Write an enzyme that holds these catalytic residues in place. Structure first.
Site, PDB file in Angstrom:
ATOM      1  N   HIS A  37      -5.935 -61.708   7.354  1.00 35.09           N
ATOM      2  CA  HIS A  37      -6.825 -62.914   6.937  1.00 35.09           C
ATOM      3  C   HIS A  37      -8.318 -62.590   7.565  1.00 35.09           C
ATOM      4  O   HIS A  37      -8.643 -61.948   8.632  1.00 35.09           O
ATOM      5  CB  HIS A  37      -6.203 -64.246   7.715  1.00 35.09           C
ATOM      6  N   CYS A  84     -10.930 -67.590   3.234  1.00 36.27           N
ATOM      7  CA  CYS A  84     -10.098 -66.052   3.600  1.00 36.27           C
ATOM      8  C   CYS A  84     -10.668 -65.158   2.592  1.00 36.27           C
ATOM      9  O   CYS A  84     -10.328 -65.490   1.155  1.00 36.27           O
ATOM     10  CB  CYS A  84      -8.573 -66.202   3.749  1.00 36.27           C
ATOM     11  N   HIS A  87      -7.724 -63.695   0.533  1.00 38.43           N
ATOM     12  CA  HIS A  87      -6.752 -64.454  -0.022  1.00 38.43           C
ATOM     13  C   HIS A  87      -7.259 -65.862  -0.915  1.00 38.43           C
ATOM     14  O   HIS A  87      -6.687 -66.714  -1.048  1.00 38.43           O
ATOM     15  CB  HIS A  87      -5.833 -65.228   0.839  1.00 38.43           C
ATOM     16  N   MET A  92      -6.292 -69.746  -0.472  1.00 40.60           N
ATOM     17  CA  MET A  92      -6.493 -69.845   0.890  1.00 40.60           C
ATOM     18  C   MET A  92      -7.797 -70.334   1.158  1.00 40.60           C
ATOM     19  O   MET A  92      -8.832 -69.592   1.615  1.00 40.60           O
ATOM     20  CB  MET A  92      -6.244 -68.669   1.830  1.00 40.60           C
TER      21      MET A  92
HETATM   22 CU   LIG Z   1      -5.921 -65.181   4.360  1.00 41.57          CU
END
Ligand SMILES: [Cu+]
Length: 99
Positions: A37, A84, A87, A92
């Protein structure tokens, strides 16, 4: 205040994914589960006057182990969207209200 990167069940989420903080309070993003992340702020969704480069990791910088942190403190009031980079397309993303 602490925000987890990844839920304990492996979900690709910030925990919490929306919250409010007073201006200048430290926000500590803490790597939890479901790596890699990282944390960036969206230049099209922050207050007027905010330079996201000052409060964002590099896209190239990935947090790959539990317990790593990225800390920022936001001085300008209003709404900020963070995301992120690996993601973002998986939803995210989160929102912090600085008041
Ligand atoms: Cu992430």
């Amino acid at each position: 205040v602490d925000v987890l990167l990844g839920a304990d069940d492996g979900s690709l989420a910030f925990v919490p994914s929306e919250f409010s903080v007073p201006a200048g309070e430290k926000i500590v993003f803490k790597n939890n589960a479901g790596f890699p992340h990282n944390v960036l702020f969206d230049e099209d969704a922050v207050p007027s006057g905010v330079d996201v480069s000052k409060i964002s990791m590099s896209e190239e910088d990935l947090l790959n182990a539990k317990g790593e942190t990225f800390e920022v403190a936001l001085s300008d009031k209003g709404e900020y969207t963070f995301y992120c980079s690996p993601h973002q397309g998986a939803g995210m993303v989160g929102k912090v209200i600085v008041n």
